[PDB]
Ligand binder design. Sequence first.
Ligand SMILES: *[C@@H]1O[C@@H]2CO[C@@H]([C@H]2O)[C@H]1F
Ligand SMILES: *[C@@H]1O[C@@H]2CO[C@@H]([C@H]2O)[C@H]1F
Ligand SMILES: [Cl-]
Ligand SMILES: [Cl-]
Ligand SMILES: [Cl-]
Ligand SMILES: [Cl-]
Ligand code: NA
Ligand code: NA
Lengths: 659, 659
Amino acid sequence: PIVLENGKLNINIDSKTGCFSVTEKTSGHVWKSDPWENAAGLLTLTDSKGKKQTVNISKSKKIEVSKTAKNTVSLKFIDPVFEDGSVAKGVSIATELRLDPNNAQLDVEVTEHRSGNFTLYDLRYPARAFSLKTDEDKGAAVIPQKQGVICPSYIFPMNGGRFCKWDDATYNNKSQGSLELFNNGTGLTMPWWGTYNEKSAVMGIVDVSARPHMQYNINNNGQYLFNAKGVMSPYQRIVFLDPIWKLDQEKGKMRISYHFIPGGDYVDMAKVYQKEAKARGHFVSLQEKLKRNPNVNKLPGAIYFGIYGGYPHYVNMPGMAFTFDELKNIIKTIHDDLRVDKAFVHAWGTFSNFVPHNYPISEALGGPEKLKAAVDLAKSYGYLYSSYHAYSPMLENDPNFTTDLMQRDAEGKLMNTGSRWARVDPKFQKGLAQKNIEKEISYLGLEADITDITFAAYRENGKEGRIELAKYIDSFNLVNGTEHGQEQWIPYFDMFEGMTYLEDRPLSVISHPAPLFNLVYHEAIANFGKIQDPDNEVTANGDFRIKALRSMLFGRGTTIFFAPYEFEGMRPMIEMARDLVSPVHKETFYSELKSHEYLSADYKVQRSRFSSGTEVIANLGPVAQKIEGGISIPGYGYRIQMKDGSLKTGHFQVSLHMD
Amino acid sequence: PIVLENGKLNINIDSKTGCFSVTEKTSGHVWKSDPWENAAGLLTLTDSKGKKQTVNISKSKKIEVSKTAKNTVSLKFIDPVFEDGSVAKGVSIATELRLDPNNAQLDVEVTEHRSGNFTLYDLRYPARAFSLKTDEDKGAAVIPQKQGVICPSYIFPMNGGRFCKWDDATYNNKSQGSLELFNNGTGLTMPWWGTYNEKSAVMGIVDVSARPHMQYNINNNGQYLFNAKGVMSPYQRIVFLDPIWKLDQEKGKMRISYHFIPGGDYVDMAKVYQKEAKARGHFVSLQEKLKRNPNVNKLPGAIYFGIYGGYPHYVNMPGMAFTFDELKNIIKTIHDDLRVDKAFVHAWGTFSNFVPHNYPISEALGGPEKLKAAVDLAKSYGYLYSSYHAYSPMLENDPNFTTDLMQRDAEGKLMNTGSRWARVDPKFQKGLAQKNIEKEISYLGLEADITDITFAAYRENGKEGRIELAKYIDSFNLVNGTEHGQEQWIPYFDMFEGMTYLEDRPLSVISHPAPLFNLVYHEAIANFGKIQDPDNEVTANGDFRIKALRSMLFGRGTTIFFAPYEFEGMRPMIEMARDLVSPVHKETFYSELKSHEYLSADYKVQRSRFSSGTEVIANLGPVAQKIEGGISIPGYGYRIQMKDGSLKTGHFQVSLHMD
Ligand SMILES: *[C@@H]1O[C@@H]2CO[C@@H]([C@H]2O)[C@H]1F
Ligand SMILES: *[C@@H]1O[C@@H]2CO[C@@H]([C@H]2O)[C@H]1F
Ligand SMILES: [Cl-]
Ligand SMILES: [Cl-]
Ligand SMILES: [Cl-]
Ligand SMILES: [Cl-]
Ligand code: NA
Ligand code: NA
């Protein structure tokens, strides 16, 4: 066995297989290689019949493992062998393991692959590494799926209905699969993931140039590998996360950097990535942004109101569109009646054309002067105001629809024919924004702007055009927001609408929300709830009780998103948000979310600590529970130490009034 | 233009294509054939080279349409043509349309199919029939997906967040796909579906011998047919539901019976099917069941309590398992403290072996005498009691696990390796129940029984063993319940736990729950909320406010399902269910749900009328809304006319208690 070692880690590399283990010397924890099949890697490729097959590369005809430098081991896997015994002759995979000379860090890189007459697809490498043993290790997989989740490596008490779904999911295909980097759907928002138990944590940071996918396996024993064979899995229930190198697509450096943290958990992982986030240039702080624009300080303690008038979906839809006088009256009621001190008013439906033609201000709704009156009222309160804007859509129901603004692929076929809100090629989008955005800023005296869709993901295709549009918008020095966001867009915006949770998502029944993105970026970007899943709607992610408490724990702002006819029903939630969430949001807005903890066995009682000196404890479940020192946190209740030392305690109650 | 006609309907058949239109003569509404491609059917088959392809059978080499009887048109589609222009020589499809001589009914049947040297797969027939034109027809598709949904054929006001998800789904793949019959997952619980507008309704009833799937298209313009070609759809947005006949699987009669109802909607469709359900033998009324077993009358007004002790998933799990003294005390508190007058107490975790060995009563939890003391207390209150029972599982973590009782397929391979709760071949399950159920009934003096899993679906494989188990359990004449249920099992049970809604499901963002199943079967089977989505959990299907109101509208009972440590947090919801839902459930339990209506344009305010003389109006949304007479229904509010003349009015309120 070839050995790489420094003061902190011992890497054992098996000469016959290329599998490796990592001993964290301070704790004695041994991170094992593939516990199921001793596969260093899992390679998907075509066979001589051209059928796709997945092979264990440790069963290749030739394995070369040699220490090519003091802290480098080079591996070569030559001529993999298929299940039927034939050989992918001429296929080879070359990899390196590079141990940092001083730090508990191991770089793993796929340096070369050769296809011969075969075609190569996925490479899980390292395969099924750094795993946790279900119900022995007491820890979790750590996955930055949108705001982030952890998946515990053991069964624990919880509501019986949740418990049945949870446990059942670890025995079927709900607990295995893959996710992608940097989308606004089911995927990850940071290029890292990890596992930890009570002794030890490990995380891998993907090279900035690469886009692997991430395979997950959450307490599954691999039965999915045997169902078509009709046999019971002989493997043990484990937790693992693997990089999937897309060999047919990947043009970057296929490197992942593993960091080993003694006694660490998801918080320590987040803080390690935060240093890398700064090095990558993503981290531009809200204090810096405030220095550049004092109007940033109208965000702390602001409720984000989206007044949804059926636009961009429809122009002047009966029963949904607001007039401009109606808009003004809603703004006035929020301020005078509901005593909301700070607000971001976002009015969806101000233009009489479909996006991406964000103009003119609609005559039917009252015309420019009446909109200006509504905006001038909001400004006189110190509120932020934006209309709905988007430069990416090309809508079937728009009379100005044209495929001329769309993008075509290498075969000349239109792209995103099935995705109406993102059809305009990004290379056109600055020109579309240029048609009226400066005239609207000038006429309405705008201080803020929110733009939909274009910055919700960070994909390679079209990236140059999105950056161009980001720089143009950012040049006006408005307080500016965008839908969902990604870490790459943080330098160009002050707030993200979203960066929370999908309602229906892989892992939902076997994970707990964790503020992983905000543990990294809360000082650099303000986020608010997603308009599709706002705090006034009851969804898979909770009711107002749950969402308000999670808001304070995770450091996000309140989102009230409503059609105009609902407004009267919004009042109690605006009031409770005003009284409970807004002062905590205000106090913690610029600070670092230093730590988050789960304080109860069922993960429902949590504690967050902000560098403002603010501490938030909240109980997101129905039953009072005790924490350290016998303090009891009521169901749907909270206990908050503010910066000045005052203690706030309370809870939400659901009542039935009977006439 | 061959014609079938009677006094109520006019069927116009095209001789060149086989497409037909139906004129419903009372309203004059015309149901058109395929508005997109003039396809009578869509046939999926392999080509010369073995690739699956889907063809328009109206483009076949030869099409014969002849009136072959007074009210029968026979159609023949010979030699379908592929898209490249090659021919499926020797493939044919024969169909018939048979108009009832007197009634507004049209039978449609695939009588013969010949495959030659190709392989036939799916046949949509009739294809894209009985469609609604989006935003022109004001109506809905009607789909008995579990309890049932309707899918409006037009955009309407709703919460802004729901609105974006709704409208967006009609432009992507969320609005197209297929469902299956008689499963406990995403599928249909009754073999019918339909469409209606403001003039007329049509529904199709599938032959009892057949198992087609159901294709849906909910306001989609068919862009999904063109995404791979990378062009824009030229078709218009429509709603349709099609039979999918699985030609490679189907052994029954491929017949569907269309019924045409002037001025009808989903209520009228349900009542049409209710006649066929009685004819099929499914409909055994709760009044007949009460005549056989007076204890059935302990169900009306009962809250269904599941005390989830971590079983069947684990035996005596720390932090989840209850002792029998603890169980007794929970029962005592529910009665003496919470004043719950009627209840079904369901204790999950009473045996020291894993299911399917439902014995012995656990010594570790206290032994048989202490369990008897709990059951005796329950019975002294007039409560029903059951342990958790299941005879279908074969669990990996059971020390007695064996593949001996699992089913194998023709190749000797284990079946359901992926589905741990349904592994025991149903031909063994009566014998497994016989091992101890009679001893338990005898020793505890049981009056009730609930069984998990076995009767949640109605599949062909294993049906006879399931029927044998059902007859055995039914022979004890206990009040008996089962998980989920299906219409075929109604003769054997008094209550179904479930038959409501999955949390995550196809159509969820573009449908409204409608009590289709209970509109048919409320007089015949009692249902309660599903244990995984109980009324005390906040999920995609609502919080307690929404679930309690929907309970009274749809005619189901309350389900409070909790781990023991949660019990104190359940108190407020038990009290609210006690005061609001229980008296309405009690009054309406045996009655027919005569009618259901949506009274607001956002479908949140609804009215149900029961044949007990009870009318339930409730508002499942946040804002007060007015109905006829200018009566206002508060947000999360209700207006209930009871049989005794009293009018119950009230609403739920969320409040913030800041200490
Ligand atoms: C029946 O089936 C399985 C076992 O118990 C639960 C579910 O997890 C019940 F729903
Ligand atoms: C941005 O994208 C589309 C359009 O508006 C919504 C969504 O439907 C917003 F989220
Ligand atoms: Cl875009
Ligand atoms: Cl959040
Ligand atoms: Cl079964
Ligand atoms: Cl329901
Ligand atoms: Na800005
Ligand atoms: Na019975």
